[PDB]
Design an enzyme around this catalytic site. Structure first.
Site, PDB file in Angstrom:
ATOM      1  CB  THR A 132     -23.441 -52.491 -12.633  1.00 14.13           C
ATOM      2  OG1 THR A 132     -23.611 -51.627 -12.940  1.00 14.13           O
ATOM      3  CG2 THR A 132     -23.467 -53.412 -13.001  1.00 14.13           C
TER       4      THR A 132
ATOM      5  CG  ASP B 253     -23.050 -45.223 -14.004  1.00 16.37           C
ATOM      6  OD1 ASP B 253     -24.399 -45.872 -12.852  1.00 16.37           O
ATOM      7  OD2 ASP B 253     -23.639 -45.306 -15.259  1.00 16.37           O
TER       8      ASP B 253
HETATM    9  N1  LIG Z   1     -20.838 -51.730   0.823  1.00 14.07           N
HETATM   10  C1  LIG Z   1     -22.658 -52.223   0.768  1.00 14.07           C
HETATM   11  N2  LIG Z   1     -23.285 -53.501   1.200  1.00 14.07           N
HETATM   12  C2  LIG Z   1     -24.084 -54.636   0.987  1.00 14.07           C
HETATM   13  N3  LIG Z   1     -24.791 -53.620  -0.246  1.00 14.07           N
HETATM   14  C3  LIG Z   1     -23.948 -53.129  -1.046  1.00 14.07           C
HETATM   15  C4  LIG Z   1     -22.958 -52.432  -0.795  1.00 14.07           C
HETATM   16  N4  LIG Z   1     -22.904 -51.349  -0.924  1.00 14.07           N
HETATM   17  C5  LIG Z   1     -23.145 -50.940  -2.594  1.00 14.07           C
HETATM   18  N5  LIG Z   1     -24.267 -52.386  -2.743  1.00 14.07           N
HETATM   19  C6  LIG Z   1     -26.034 -52.787  -3.339  1.00 14.07           C
HETATM   20  O1  LIG Z   1     -24.862 -53.109  -4.706  1.00 14.07           O
HETATM   21  C7  LIG Z   1     -25.803 -51.846  -5.119  1.00 14.07           C
HETATM   22  C8  LIG Z   1     -25.185 -51.139  -6.198  1.00 14.07           C
HETATM   23  O2  LIG Z   1     -25.580 -50.074  -6.857  1.00 14.07           O
HETATM   24  P1  LIG Z   1     -24.779 -48.596  -7.950  1.00 14.07           P
HETATM   25  O3  LIG Z   1     -23.723 -49.074  -7.548  1.00 14.07           O
HETATM   26  O4  LIG Z   1     -25.675 -47.934  -7.662  1.00 14.07           O
HETATM   27  O5  LIG Z   1     -25.626 -49.126  -9.329  1.00 14.07           O
HETATM   28  P2  LIG Z   1     -25.917 -50.370  -9.558  1.00 14.07           P
HETATM   29  O6  LIG Z   1     -26.709 -51.415  -9.141  1.00 14.07           O
HETATM   30  O7  LIG Z   1     -25.653 -50.511 -10.977  1.00 14.07           O
HETATM   31  O8  LIG Z   1     -24.429 -50.777  -9.735  1.00 14.07           O
HETATM   32  C9  LIG Z   1     -26.963 -51.569  -4.667  1.00 14.07           C
HETATM   33  O9  LIG Z   1     -28.148 -51.420  -4.720  1.00 14.07           O
HETATM   34  C10 LIG Z   1     -26.754 -51.927  -3.116  1.00 14.07           C
HETATM   35  O10 LIG Z   1     -27.405 -52.600  -2.637  1.00 14.07           O
HETATM   36 MG   LIG Z   2     -25.339 -47.120  -9.400  1.00 13.95          MG
END
Ligand SMILES: Nc1ncnc2c1ncn2[C@@H]1O[C@H](COP(=O)(O)OP(=O)(O)O)[C@@H](O)[C@H]1O
Ligand SMILES: [Mg+2]
Ligand SMILES: Nc1ncnc2c1ncn2[C@@H]1O[C@H](COP(=O)(O)OP(=O)(O)O)[C@@H](O)[C@H]1O
Ligand SMILES: Nc1ncnc2c1ncn2[C@@H]1O[C@H](COP(=O)(O)OP(=O)(O)O)[C@@H](O)[C@H]1O
Ligand SMILES: [Mg+2]
Ligand SMILES: [Mg+2]
Lengths: 520, 546, 536, 48, 191
Positions: free
Chosen positions: A90, A56
C-alpha cells in the site's frame, strides 16, 4: 481518407498529463484509508461471483480492471512489490501518487522540463538509499524472541493482531523448517503449503511438518494408523497402461483371448510383486489405480492413495526424503522413504484428511488453518503469506530499519537540509521529493483521528534535534519513540518502495500523447 | 481538400478518380499527419507515448519503428513511411524517428516547388546532386576513432543511443554494460573479419530493485524453468559439462503410418518393454558420459526424469532452437540433432560435451533463470533488466536493442561524427555556395534541400520549450565561419551542436556524444528514395473491394 | 484533417467540385448533347419534337427556344444555352436553333485547341476579332433595298415571309400566310416606314376548323355572346350614317353608389317609396343617355344585372358583359374611339366606328365568339388562325409570330442578306485568308472559327441527305472562283445553288446576331474552371 | 494507348462528315501500310 | 406541472383579478401587463366589424390586396361570400356574416353577388365561401352540406373559423369556450 484507423485525433500537450496525474491520484484515494492499525476493509464484486474481503494493497489492485491506460502503470506496482517481497504494497501506491501530485504544479507553473525532473529524482533516490543505510542497523537473526516482534509489525495492521501470540509461533516454526543452508536463504514460498479448512477455531492450530492430503484410502481393509510408515512415490499408474502405437491383435486360435487377459493379470501380478521387493507400507501415485491391483497389495499392507498432484508429490519427497521413480523395477531400499511417523487419518464429515510427520536439507510443511468462513480463511492465509514475507528479508540480510513514518520523515529532513544547499535549477523538483515522503506519516495520523497539522509540526522540531527512531503511534497519536513499543520492519520493504515509486514516476512523467484504436 | 471531385465523368471506372494538385496536397498532409506523432519523440527532450489496443493492453514506446507498425494506416502514401521506419530498424537499427521527419519535410518543402512549374524530375536531380555532394562532405568531415591515449570512445557512443529513453539518466551505468557485453560475444568469419551478432545476448524481463542495480552476467542466462522440484538447483565445481540435445526424448509411437500387428500374445509385453527400454538406453549412455547439465529442445517425459534425479543431472525441457546454438557456441559444445556416426553402431562421444565453470538457477519475482557463467572456449553475456512492469521493460528492451546496433556500427566502421545537428547544419553552408555554381533551375532544388535538413536541430529546440531561433542563429554563425575558416590547428567553429539541458553551444567531443557516419549515409539515401516515390505520383485509382 | 471535422462551407458533403481538363470535357460534351437535339431539327428538312410538360400537356415544336424552355435539365451549361435561345427568341425572333448549333460549333472546335495548350483568353479574343471582322465584311457586301419603290418592297417581305414560314408546319398554306403576313403590316405601318409598333397586333388562336378556313379580319376577338340572345345575331348599320357608333363604358349599369362603404338609412315609409322611385329613374335616365348618344352596340367592363336586358332589347341595343380591361385597350385603338368613364361625360365624339358586328357558331356547342370587321385601313390587325388540333394551332401562333418579327426586322432600313448557307461560307473563307498573314499565336483560333461557321451548311447537308464534303467543296470553290456571294445550299431541291433566283431572304440584323450570341457565350463558358454544384 | 485515342478523335469529326466507317477504317490500314515503308527507308542498320 | 400554468393561462384580465388575494402581486401583475398588451393589439387590429358589400371592380381592391394587410407579416383573413338571393343557404350564410362581424372585428367579412363574382357561375354551386390570406386562397369551400346544410348554426360556423387559423382555439369569444355565467356559478357551488 482517414489516414489512421487508430485515433486519427489526438489528445496532446498538457491536458494528457492532467488526465495522467489525476488518474494516478484517483487510484491512491480508494486505498488511502487502508493504512495503519485502524485501517478499514474493502469488498470487491468480481464478475465470476467469488467475493473477497481484503485490505492488502495487492489484492485490491489485481481484482479491479481499469480502463485508463496511464493508471494501469500504478496498478502493477503492487504486483511488482508482491512477487518481490510480499509486504508493504500500500505504501508504494500512495507514495507514487504523492510524488506525481507534488510534481504536478511545475510544468503548469514553472514550465520546467521533465528530463530535468528525471535527473532530480535519481539524485534524490541516490541520497534516499544513503540515508536509509545510515538510519538502518543490524540485529541478531538467531534470537527467536526478537523475530516475534518483527513478524508482529506487519500483523498489527491485519485482523489477526488479536492472535499475534499464536500467529508468530505459527509462522516462525514454518519458515525455519523450509529454511536451509547453502543468496544464503534460497528457500521459496512454493515449498510452503497452506491448506484452508473451513470450520474449527483459529486458536487451536499447530505447525505439522508434513503434507495434508484431501482424500480417503481406496480399499476398506487398509489400516489407517501406521507406526513406522515407509513412503514410496510413483508416477506410473497401477492400471494397465495403453500403448500409443494402437496395436491390433489378430486372434485366430481360441486360447489367445484367454491368454491376453491372463497376461493382463500376470503383468499386474508381476508389477505388484516388484513393489513388494522393498516391502513398503505407504505408496503414493499421481494416476489411477485398478481394482485388480488393490487385492495383491493387501498382503503387504501397502496403503495406496491416487490422483495426487504433481506439486504435492514433490512436497512429499522433501519431507520423507523419498525419490520419485516412474518404473517399478528401479525400487531400492534407498528409494524408500524413511524417518516418517504418526500416520493417522482423522475422521471429519466433510472430507478425509491424512497427517504426516518426520522423526537433503530441504524440508516442507502444511499449515492447517481453522476458521469460520472460506473468505476469512483467505484473509488469514494471505496474512500467513505476509507473516513469512516480512521474515525472509531479516534472514536474507541482517539489516533492519524502523518504520511507522519515522524512516520516511528521516528522508525528508535530510533532503530538506541539502535542498537549500544545492542552489540550482533542479532544486525545485528536489524539494518535491522531500515533501512527498510526508503523506505516509500524514496518512497514518489522519486515519488514527488526530490533528495532523500540529502533530507533524512538533515532529519536525523533534527530528531537528538529531534523532531518527521517533515515529507516530497509530492508536492515540503520540510522538513517542518506537524503541519502547517495538515497531520495526526490514530495510528491503522501504528500499523497494522508494525505488519502485521513483521508477514508476519516471515512466509516467514522460507521457504527452494518448492514442487508441490499434486492435493488435 | 475543399470538396470531393466528380466520380467518373464519362470515364466508366468502378472506383474513384482524382487528379491534379489536390492529391499532391493530400500526400503532403498524409506524410505530415503520420509525422506529427514522430515530432515530439525526437531528441533527448522528447517524451514517450502509449498505444492502446482497445483490450486494456498498452505499450510505452519512444522510437517510431514499432509505433507506426502498430498504427494501421489505410492511405498507401503513408505506408511507405511506415515501411521506411521498419526498413531503417533492420539495417542500421537507429534513427527511425529521423527518416520520417526528414522524408516528410523534403516532401513538404518541395510542395512549394511543384506550383512553381518546376518538374519533379528536375527537383530530384537537384536533390541528388546535393546528396552525393553531401556524402563526400560527410566523408571529409569524419574523424578518426583514437582521439587520445586511451579508447574514450565507446562509452560516449552509448550515450547517443541511450538518450531520449527512460533510462537515459542511468546511461552512465549502462554505458559500461553494453560495451562489456558486445566485446564478449564477438566471433570470427571470412578469414579475419570480426562480426557482432545483434540479439545474441539475452534480455530478461525481471522485476525487483531498480535499473541502476542491474547486474551484468559474465555469461549466458537461459530463461526456462526446472522440470522437477526434487532436482539439485546449484551445481558447483569446475569443468561442468554441457550437453545440447534436440532429438525427441519423450516416449513416442512408431513410424508415421505403420500399424503394430502380432499373433503370439507372449511377445506383446516384450515389445512394450523395448519401446520403454529403447528410450532409456539413450539416457544410460549420457550418464556414462557424465554430463552434469543436459538441455533438450523437445519435452522430457517422467521415464527420463527419474534417471536425472537419481544421478543428479540437470534436465531442462522446452528450450528453443535459436538459444541452443548460442549455448553450444559459447560453452564449446556442438549441436546434436541425433546420436549416430559414419559407422553402423550407435554411441556417444565425450567430445560433444561443452565446458563451463558454474551453473546456478536463480528466481526473482516469479522468473526462474539458469545462470551459466565461466565459459572456457568463448565468452558470453546477458543483461538482466529490472523495472516497474513488463510494458516499461519493453521500452528498455528496445532501448538496449538499439544500443547494440549503434555500438556494432562504430566498431565495424571507426568513422564517427558529432550529434546535435552538426552535420545537418554544416551541409547547408556547403550547399549554398554549391547552389550558386550550378546556375540554372536546380539552385532552388539544392537550396530548399538544404533548408529541409535544418529541421533536425530545430526540433530539438521546439520540443525543449525554449527559444529556437537564438540557438539556430548561433549554430548558423559558427558553421558559417567553418567554410571560410582560412586554413594556414586553429580551424575552430566546427564540431559544435546544441546542449539542451543548459541551452548553450559547446563542443560535442568534450560533451561526449557521437554517432557513426554510416547511419547518416543510409538514412539520407533511404529518406530520398522515399521522397522520390511520393513526388512522382500524379493520379490515384482506388478500386473498392468486391 | 488531424482528426477534427474539417468543414468550411455549409453542406460540405453534399456539393462537389470539378477542375482541370475533366471540367472542360463535361462542358463540351454537354453542349454536344444539346447540339444533337438541335442539329436534326434545323433547316427546311427538319423534324418537330414533342415536349411533355409535368401537367400532361404537350407541345409539338421545332423551335429551339420552346424546346429548351420546357426541358427539365440539371447541367448548368445547357441552362445557359436555354437562355441563349430565349435571348434570340425575345428580341429578333429568328435563329433560335442556330444560336445553339453555332455556339456548340465554336465549343467543339475549341476542344481541339484546348488539347494544344492555348490559353482560353487567347481563344476568346480570337473569336471576338474574327466576329467583328466578319461583321465588317458582311456589312459591305450586302445591298440596300430602300432605293426601290413600295411595289418591289412588298416582294422583299414575301421573300422573307416564305423563308420564315417554311421549316415550320404551316408550310402548305404558306403562300397565303405570306400574303396574309404581309397584308397585316400594310394596314399597321408608319408613313415613313420606320419604328412600327408590334404591340398593336396580338396573337389569337382557335381550336377548330381547318387551315384553309383562316382569313384576315380587322377587329377584336371576344370569347362571349351578346346579353339575352333574343335579338338577331348580325346587327346592321342604319341606311344613312357614318357607322354603327360603338360605345364603351367602364361603369356597370347600376344606381350610383359610393366607392367607400356606406349606410343609407330609411327612417320612414315615404323615404322608402322615394328609394323605389330613385331605383327606377336611374335605369330610365341611363337608357335615355345612351339613346340620345346614338349608340347601337355597348361594351361594358364590369357587367350588369338582368334588369337592363329588356331595356336594351326593346331599343334594339346589343350588349355584352365581363369584358376585360385588356380587350378595351384593343377596342379603342381598332375602332378609333374614346372610352367614356360615365354617362354624364357621354358625347357623340367619343364613340367609335366600325363596319359591322356578327357572330357564328364554328360547330355545335363550343362557344359563341364575337367578330368585328373594319371597312377601311385601321391601326389594328387580329390574325384569325384556325386549326384541326390544339398543337397545330398552338404551333401556328408562334410560327406566325416569328413571321411578323422577321418582317419587323426588315422595317429597319438597309438590313437584307441572302441566306441559305451563303452567309456562313462567305464569312468563313475570309477568316482563313486573314490567318495566313495574321498568323501569330492565334492562327489556329481563326481556323477554328472558320471551320465552325461551315457546320451549318453541313447540318443542312445531313438533313437534306446530300454529301457534306462535296457540297462544301463546291461552295468553297465557287466562292473562290467568283466574288458573287449569294450562292448557298438549296435543300428544298429546286435546282440551282444560286439563290436570289430562289426567292429566299434573311434579315441582316438577325444573321450577325448569330455569331454575336455564339461568341459572347463561348467567351463565358471558356472562363469557367471550377464547377461547384449542390444537391437538390 | 495515345495514338489510338488520337485516331479515334480524327474519326470522331469524320463520322459527322458523311463518310462510311469502313472507308475510314481502310484508309488507316492503307495509310499505316505506307507508314511502314517510309520508316524502312529511314532506319539504319547496325552491327552485331 | 399544468396546475401552475392554469392560474395565468386559463384566466383573462377580468378573471385574473380573482387571484389578487391568494397569489403574489408581482407574480400576478407581471402577467396582467402581458395580457393587457395583447388586448391593446386586438383593438388596433379591429379595423372592421360590419359586412363589406363590394362591387366587382373593388373585388381586387378590397380582397386580395387587403389580405396582405401591412405588406411584420400583418396578414388579415378575408371571408368572401358569393351571395345568391334565390338559394336557401345563401341567406343563412349572410346572417352568419352579420353575427360574426359584430364579434370578430379583426377579420374582414366580405359579400358580393355570385352573378357578379365569376363569369357565368353555376347557380347550383352557390353559395360559395372563399378565404383569402396574404393574397393566397386558404379554403375554397363548397355549399354548406359539410356544415349541416339547411340546419347550419352559429356554433358550426365559429368552429370552421378555428380550422383555417382565423381564430385561436382557446379564444374567449368562441361559444365553445364562452361558458355561460350560470354554468360557472353552478361549478363554484358544487366545488
Ligand atoms: N500500531 C502501529 N503504530 C505505529 N505504526 C504502525 C502500527 N501499525 C502499523 N504501522 C505502520 O504501518 C505500516 C503498515 O505496513 P503493512 O500493513 O505491512 O503494509 P502497507 O504499508 O502496504 O499497509 C507499517 O510499515 C508500520 O510502520
Ligand atoms: Mg503490509
Ligand atoms: N545528449 C545529446 N545532446 C544533443 N543531441 C543529442 C543528444 N542525444 C541525442 N541527440 C540527437 O538526437 C538525434 C536522434 O537521437 P536517437 O538516439 O536516434 O533518438 P531515438 O533513440 O529516439 O531514435 C541525433 O541525431 C542526435 O544528434
Ligand atoms: N425554303 C428554304 N430554302 C432554302 N433554305 C432555307 C429555306 N427555309 C429555311 N432555310 C434555311 O434554313 C436555315 C435554318 O432556318 P430555321 O432553323 O428553320 O430557322 P430558325 O433557326 O429561326 O428556327 C436558315 O439559315 C435558312 O437560310
Ligand atoms: Mg537512437
Ligand atoms: Mg426560322
Amino acid at each position: 481518407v482517414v489516414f489512421m484507423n487508430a485515433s486519427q485525433e489526438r489528445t496532446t500537450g498538457r491536458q494528457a498529463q492532467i488526465s495522467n496525474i489525476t488518474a494516478a491520484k484517483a487510484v491512491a484515494d480508494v486505498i488511502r484509508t487502508c493504512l495503519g492499525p485502524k485501517a478499514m476493509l474493502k469488498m470487491l464484486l468480481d464478475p465470476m461471483g467469488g467475493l473477497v474481503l481484503t485490505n492488502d494493497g495487492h489484492a485490491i489492485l489485481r481484482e479491479i480492471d481499469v480502463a485508463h491506460p496511464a493508471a494501469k502503470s500504478m496498478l502493477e506496482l503492487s504486483r511488482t512489490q508482491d512477487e518481490e517481497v510480499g509486504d508493504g504494497t500500500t505504501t508504494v501506491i500512495i507514495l507514487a501518487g504523492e510524488i506525481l501530485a507534488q510534481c504536478a504544479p511545475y510544468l503548469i507553473e514553472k514550465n520546467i522540463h521533465p528530463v530535468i525532473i528525471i535527473q532530480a529524482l535519481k539524485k534524490a533516490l541516490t541520497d534516499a538509499l544513503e540515508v536509509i543505510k545510515q538510519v538502518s542497523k543490524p540485529v541478531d537473526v538467531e534470537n527467536d524472541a526478537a523475530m516475534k516482534k518483527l513478524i508482529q509489525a506487519s500483523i498489527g495492521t491485519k485482523y489477526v493482531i488479536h492472535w499475534s501470540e499464536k500467529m508468530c509461533e505459527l509462522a516462525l516454526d514454518a519458515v525455519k523448517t523450509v529454511r536451509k543452508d547453502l543468496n544464503f536463504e534460497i528457500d521459496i514460498k512454493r515449498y510452503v503449503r497452506v491448506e484452508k479448512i473451513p470450520g474449527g477455531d483459529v486458536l487451536d492450530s499447530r505447525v505439522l511438518k508434513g503434507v495434508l492430503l484431501n482424500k480417503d484410502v481406496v480399499h476398506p481393509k487398509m489400516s489407517r494408523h501406521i507406526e513406522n510408515p515407509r513412503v514410496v512415490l510413483l508416477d506410473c499408474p497401477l492400471e494397465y497402461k495403453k500403448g500409443e502405437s494402437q496395436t491390433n491383435i489378430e486372434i485366430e486360435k481360441e486360447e489367445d483371448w484367454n491368454r491376453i487377459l491372463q497376461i493382463e493379470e500376470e503383468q499386474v501380478q508381476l508389477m505388484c510383486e516388484q513393489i513388494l521387493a522393498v516391502r513398503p507400507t505407504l505408496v503414493i501415485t499421481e494416476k489411477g489405480v485398478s481394482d485388480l491391483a488393490q487385492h495383491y497389495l493387501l498382503k503387504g499392507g501397502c496403503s495406496v492413495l491416487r490422483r495426487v498432484k504433481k506439486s504435492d508429490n514433490n512436497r512429499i519427497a522433501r519431507v520423507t526424503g523419498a525419490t520419485i521413480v516412474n518404473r517399478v523395477e528401479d525400487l531400492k531400499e534407498s528409494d524408500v522413504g524413511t524417518n516418517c511417523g504418526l500416520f493417522k487419518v482423522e475422521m471429519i464429515g466433510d472430507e478425509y484428511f491424512s497427517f504426516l510427520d518426520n522423526c537433503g536439507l530441504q524440508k516442507a510443511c502444511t499449515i492447517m488453518l481453522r476458521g469460520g468462513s472460506k473468505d476469512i480463511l483467505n484473509e488469514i492465509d494471505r496474512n500467513l503469506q505476509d507473516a513469512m514475507a516480512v521474515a525472509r528479508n531479516v534472514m536474507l540480510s541482517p539489516s533492519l530499519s524502523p518504520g511507522g513514518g519515522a524512516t520516511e520523515m528521516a528522508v525528508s529532513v535530510k533532503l530538506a537540509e541539502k535542498a537549500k544547499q544545492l542552489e540550482g535549477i533542479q532544486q525545485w523538483p528536489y524539494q518535491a521529493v522531500a515533501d512527498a515522503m510526508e503523506c505516509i506519516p500524514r496518512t497514518l495520523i489522519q486515519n488514527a483521528g488526530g490533528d495532523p497539522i500540529r502533530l507533524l509540526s512538533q515532529l519536525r522540531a523533534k527530528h531537528a534535534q538529531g534523532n531518527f527512531t521517533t515515529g507516530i503511534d497509530g492508536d492515540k497519536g503520540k510522538i513517542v519513540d518506537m524503541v519502547s513499543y517495538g515497531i520495526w520492519e526490514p530495510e528491503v520493504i522501504k528500499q523497494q518502495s522508494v525505488k519502485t515509486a521513483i521508477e514508476s514516476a519516471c515512466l509516467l512523467l514522460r507521457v504527452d500523447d494518448i492514442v487508441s484504436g490499434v486492435r493488435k | 481538400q475543399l470538396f470531393n471531385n466528380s466520380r467518373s465523368d464519362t470515364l466508366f471506372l468502378g472506383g474513384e478518380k482524382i487528379s491534379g494538385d489536390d492529391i499532391r496536397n493530400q500526400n503532403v498532409l498524409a506524410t505530415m499527419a503520420v509525422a506529427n506523432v514522430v515530432k515530439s519523440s525526437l531528441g533527448p527532450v522528447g517524451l514517450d507515448k502509449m498505444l492502446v489496443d482497445d483490450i486494456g493492453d498498452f505499450t510505452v514506446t519512444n522510437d517510431g519503428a514499432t509505433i507506426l507498425s502498430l498504427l494501421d494506416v489505410q492511405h498507401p502514401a503513408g505506408k511507405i513511411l511506415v515501411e521506411l521506419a521498419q526498413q531503417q530498424d533492420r539495417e542500421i537499427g537507429d534513427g527511425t524517428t529521423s527518416v520520417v521527419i526528414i522524408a516528410s519535410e523534403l516532401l513538404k518543402r518541395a510542395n512549394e516547388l511543384v506550383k512553381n512549374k518546376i518538374h519533379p524530375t528536375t527537383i530530384i536531380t537537384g536533390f541528388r546532386v546535393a546528396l552525393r555532394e553531401a556524402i563526400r562532405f560527410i566523408n571529409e568531415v569524419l574523424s578518426t576513432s583514437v582521439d587520445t591515449l586511451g579508447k574514450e570512445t565507446l562509452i560516449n557512443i552509448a550515450k547517443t543511443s541511450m538518450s531520449s529513453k527512460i533510462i537515459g539518466a542511468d546511461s552512465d551505468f549502462f554505458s559500461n554494460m553494453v560495451v562489456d557485453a558486445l566485446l564478449a560475444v564477438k566471433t570470427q568469419n571470412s578469414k579475419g573479419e570480426i562480426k557482432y551478432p545483434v540479439k545474441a545476448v539475452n534480455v530478461l524481463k525481471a522485476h525487483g530493485k531498480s535499473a541502476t542495480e542491474s547486474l551484468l552476467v559474465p555469461g549466458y542466462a537461459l530463461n526456462c524453468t526446472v522440470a522437477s522440484q526434487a532436482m539439485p538447483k546449484r551445481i558447483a565445481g569446475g569443468n561442468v559439462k554441457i550437453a545440447c540435445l534436440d532429438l525427441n526424448l519423450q516416449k513416442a509411437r512408431m513410424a508415421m503410418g505403420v500399424q503394430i500387428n502380432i499373433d503370439d500374445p507372449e511377445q506383446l509385453e516384450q515389445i512394450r518393454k523395448r519401446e520403454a527400454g529403447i528410450v532409456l538406453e539413450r539416457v544410460k549412455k549420457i550418464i556414462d558420459a557424465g554430463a552434469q547439465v543436459v538441455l533438450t529442445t523437445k519435452g522430457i517425459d517422467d521415464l527420463c526424469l527419474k534417471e536425472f534425479v537419481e544421478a543428479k543431472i540437470m534436465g531442462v525441457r522446452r528450450c528453443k532452437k535459436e538459444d541452443l546454438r548460442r549455448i553450444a557456441r559459447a560453452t564449446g559444445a556442438t549441436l546434436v540433432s541425433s546420436m549416430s556416426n559414419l559407422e553402423g553402431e550407435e554411441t556417444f562421444e565425450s567430445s560433444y560435451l561443452g565446458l563451463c565453470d558454474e551453473v546456478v538457477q536463480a528466481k526473482f519475482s516469479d522468473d526462474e533463470c539458469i545462470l551459466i557463467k565461466g565459459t572456457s572456449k568463448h565468452s558470453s553475456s546477458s543483461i538482466i533488466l529490472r523495472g516497474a512492469n513488463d510494458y516499461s521493460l519493453d521500452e528498455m528492451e528496445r532501448s538496449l536493442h538499439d544500443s547494440l546496433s549503434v555500438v556494432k556500427r562504430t566498431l565495424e566502421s571507426g568513422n564517427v561524427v558529432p550529434g546535435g545537428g552538426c552535420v545537418e547544419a554544416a551541409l547547408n553552408i556547403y550547399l549554398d555556395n554549391f547552389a550558386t555554381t550550378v546556375g540554372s533551375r536546380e539552385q532552388l532544388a539544392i537550396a530548399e534541400f538544404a533548408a529541409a535538413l535544418l529541421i533536425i536541430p530545430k526540433t530539438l529546440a521546439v520540443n525543449a520549450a525554449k527559444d529556437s531561433s537564438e540557438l539556430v542563429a548561433k549554430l548558423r554563425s559558427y558553421h558559417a565561419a567553418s567554410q571560410m575558416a582560412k586554413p594556414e590547428k586553429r580551424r575552430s567553429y566546427r564540431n559544435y551542436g546544441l546542449d539542451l539541458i543548459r541551452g548553450k553551444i559547446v563542443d560535442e567531443i568534450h560533451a561526449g556524444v557521437l554517432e557513426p557516419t554510416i547511419s547518416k549515409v543510409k538514412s539520407l539515401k533511404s529518406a530520398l528514395e522515399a521522397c522520390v516515390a511520393i513526388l512522382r505520383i500524379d493520379t490515384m485509382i482506388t478500386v473498392d473491394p468486391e | 484533417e488531424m482528426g477534427r471535422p474539417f468543414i468550411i462551407v455549409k453542406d460540405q458533403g453534399n456539393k462537389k467540385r470539378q477542375h482541370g481538363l475533366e471540367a472542360k470535357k463535361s462542358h463540351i460534351l454537354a453542349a454536344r448533347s444539346v447540339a444533337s437535339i438541335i442539329k436534326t431539327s434545323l433547316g427546311p428538312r427538319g423534324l418537330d419534337k414533342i415536349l411533355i410538360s409535368p401537367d400532361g400537356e404537350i407541345t409539338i415544336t421545332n423551335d429551339g427556344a420552346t424546346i429548351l424552355s420546357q426541358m427539365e435539365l440539371d447541367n448548368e451549361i445547357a441552362k445557359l444555352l436555354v437562355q441563349l435561345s430565349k435571348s434570340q427568341d425575345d428580341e429578333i425572333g429568328d435563329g433560335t436553333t442556330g444560336v445553339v448549333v453555332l455556339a456548340s460549333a465554336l465549343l467543339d472546335q475549341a476542344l481541339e485547341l484546348i488539347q494544344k495548350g492555348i490559353h482560353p483568353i487567347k481563344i476568346a479574343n480570337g473569336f471576338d476579332e474574327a466576329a467583328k471582322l466578319a461583321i465588317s465584311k458582311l456589312e459591305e457586301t450586302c445591298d440596300d433595298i430602300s432605293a426601290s419603290n413600295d411595289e418591289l418592297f412588298r416582294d422583299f417581305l414575301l421573300r422573307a415571309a416564305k423563308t420564315s414560314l417554311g421549316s415550320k408546319i404551316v408550310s402548305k398554306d404558306h403562300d397565303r400566310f405570306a400574303e396574309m403576313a404581309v397584308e397585316a403590316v400594310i394596314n399597321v405601318m408608319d408613313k415613313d416606314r420606320k419604328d412600327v409598333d408590334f404591340d398593336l397586333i396580338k396573337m389569337q388562336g382557335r381550336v377548330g376548323g381547318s387551315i384553309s378556313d383562316s382569313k384576315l379580319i380587322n377587329g377584336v376577338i371576344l370569347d362571349k355572346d351578346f346579353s339575352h340572345p333574343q335579338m338577331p345575331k348580325c346587327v346592321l348599320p342604319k341606311e344613312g350614317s357614318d357607322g354603327v357608333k360603338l360605345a364603351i363604358l367602364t361603369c356597370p349599369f347600376e344606381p350610383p353608389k359610393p366607392k367607400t362603404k356606406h349606410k343609407l338609412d330609411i327612417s320612414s315609409v315615404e323615404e322608402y317609396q322615394k328609394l323605389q322611385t330613385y331605383e327606377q329613374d336611374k335605369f330610365k335616365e341611363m337608357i335615355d343617355d345612351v339613346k340620345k348618344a346614338g349608340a347601337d352596340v355597348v361594351i361594358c367592363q364590369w357587367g350588369f344585372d338582368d334588369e337592363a336586358n329588356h331595356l336594351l332589347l326593346q331599343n334594339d341595343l346589343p350588349a355584352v358583359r365581363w369584358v376585360g380591361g385588356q380587350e378595351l385597350e384593343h377596342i379603342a385603338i381598332s375602332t378609333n374611339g374614346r372610352i367614356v368613364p360615365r354617362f354624364q361625360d357621354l358625347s357623340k365624339d367619343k364613340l367609335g366606328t366600325c363596319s359591322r358586328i356578327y357572330e357564328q357558331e364554328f360547330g355545335t356547342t363550343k362557344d359563341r365568339m364575337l367578330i368585328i370587321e373594319q371597312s377601311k385601313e385601321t391601326k389594328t390587325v387580329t390574325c384569325f388562325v384556325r386549326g384541326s388540333n390544339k398543337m397545330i394551332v398552338d404551333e401556328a401562333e408562334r410560327a406566325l409570330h416569328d413571321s411578323l418579327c422577321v418582317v419587323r426586322n426588315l422595317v429597319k432600313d438597309s438590313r437584307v442578306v441572302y441566306g441559305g448557307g451563303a452567309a456562313e461560307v462567305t464569312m468563313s473563307l475570309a477568316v482563313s485568308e486573314e490567318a495566313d498573314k495574321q498568323r501569330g499565336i492565334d492562327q489556329y483560333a481563326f481556323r477554328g472559327f472558320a471551320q465552325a461557321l461551315d457546320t451549318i451548311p453541313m447540318t443542312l447537308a445531313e438533313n437534306s441527305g446530300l454529301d457534306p464534303i462535296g457540297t462544301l467543296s463546291t461552295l468553297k470553290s465557287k466562292q473562290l472562283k467568283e466574288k458573287i456571294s449569294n450562292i448557298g445550299v438549296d435543300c428544298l431541291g429546286y435546282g440551282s445553288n444560286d439563290m436570289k433566283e430562289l426567292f429566299v431572304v434573311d434579315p441582316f440584323i438577325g444573321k450577325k446576331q448569330q455569331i454575336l450570341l455564339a461568341t459572347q457565350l463561348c467567351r463565358m463558358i471558356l472562363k469557367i474552371d471550377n464547377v461547384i454544384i449542390s444537391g437538390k | 494507348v495515345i495514338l489510338t485515342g488520337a485516331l479515334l478523335g480524327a474519326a470522331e469529326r469524320l463520322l459527322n462528315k458523311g463518310i462510311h466507317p469502313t472507308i475510314i477504317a481502310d484508309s488507316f490500314q492503307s495509310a499505316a501500310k505506307r507508314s511502314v515503308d517510309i520508316l524502312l527507308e529511314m532506319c539504319h542498320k547496325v552491327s552485331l | 406541472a399544468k396546475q401552475h400554468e392554469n392560474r395565468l393561462e386559463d384566466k383573462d384580465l377580468s378573471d385574473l383579478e380573482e387571484l389578487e388575494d391568494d397569489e403574489d402581486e408581482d407574480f400576478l401583475e407581471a402577467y396582467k401587463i402581458k395580457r393587457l398588451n395583447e388586448i391593446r393589439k386586438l383593438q388596433e387590429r379591429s379595423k372592421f366589424g360590419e359586412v363589406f358589400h363590394i362591387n366587382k371592380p373593388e373585388y381586387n381592391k378590397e380582397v386580395t390586396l387587403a389580405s396582405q394587410g401591412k405588406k411584420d407579416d400583418g396578414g388579415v383573413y378575408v371571408f368572401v361570400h358569393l351571395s345568391l338571393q334565390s338559394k336557401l343557404q345563401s341567406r343563412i350564410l349572410s346572417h352568419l356574416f352579420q353575427s360574426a362581424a359584430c364579434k370578430f372585428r379583426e377579420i374582414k367579412f366580405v359579400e358580393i353577388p355570385a352573378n357578379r363574382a365569376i363569369e357565368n357561375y353555376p347557380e347550383s354551386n352557390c353559395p360559395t365561401l372563399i378565404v383569402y390570406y396574404r393574397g393566397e386562397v386558404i379554403k375554397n369551400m363548397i355549399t354548406l352540406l359539410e356544415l349541416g346544410g339547411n340546419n347550419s348554426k352559429m356554433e358550426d360556423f365559429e368552429d370552421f373559423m378555428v380550422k383555417v387559423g382565423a381564430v385561436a382555439e382557446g379564444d374567449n369569444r368562441l361559444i365553445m369556450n364562452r361558458d355561460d355565467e350560470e354554468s360557472r356559478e353552478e361549478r363554484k357551488l358544487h366545488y
